[PDB]
């Protein structure tokens, strides 16, 4: 899927850095727009460079530049309501 955007990303790094996000934008060229449920995963909307890429197998279809409310509706295409909400690391809130 990394050949084309329109998919979901995971943050990888040591010491707390696992968060799931949906990618939807191409910026200058090496930067993309990413979003996640602020209430659960904790990521709202932010931009990340290709230098940290973690792609998963998923669907491809973004209008391009969606507004936040429009971006949130797109998350449902991702089916976050229960497929996700994974808590990538057991340690995160009180730990």
From Swiss-Prot:
Keywords: Ribonucleoprotein, Ribosomal protein. GO terms for biological process: ribosomal large subunit biogenesis; translation. GO terms for cellular component: cytosolic large ribosomal subunit. One of its GO terms (molecular function) is structural constituent of ribosome. The keyword Ribonucleoprotein applies. Belongs to the eukaryotic ribosomal protein eL14 family. NCBIfam families: PRK04333.1. This is Large ribosomal subunit protein eL14. It comes from Saccharolobus solfataricus (strain ATCC 35092 / DSM 1617 / JCM 11322 / P2). The lineage of its organism: Archaea, Thermoproteota, Thermoprotei, Sulfolobales, Sulfolobaceae.
């Amino acid at each position: 899927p990394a050949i084309e955007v329109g998919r979901i990303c995971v943050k990888v790094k040591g010491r707390e850095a696992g968060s799931k996000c949906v990618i939807v934008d191409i910026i200058d060229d090496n930067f993309v727009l990413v979003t996640g449920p602020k209430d659960i995963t904790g990521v709202k909307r932010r931009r990340v460079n290709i230098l940290h890429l973690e792609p998963t197998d998923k669907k491809i279809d973004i209008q391009k530049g969606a507004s936040d409310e429009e971006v949130k509706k797109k998350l449902e295409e991702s089916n976050l309501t229960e497929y996700m909400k994974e808590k990538i690391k057991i340690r995160m809130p009180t730990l």
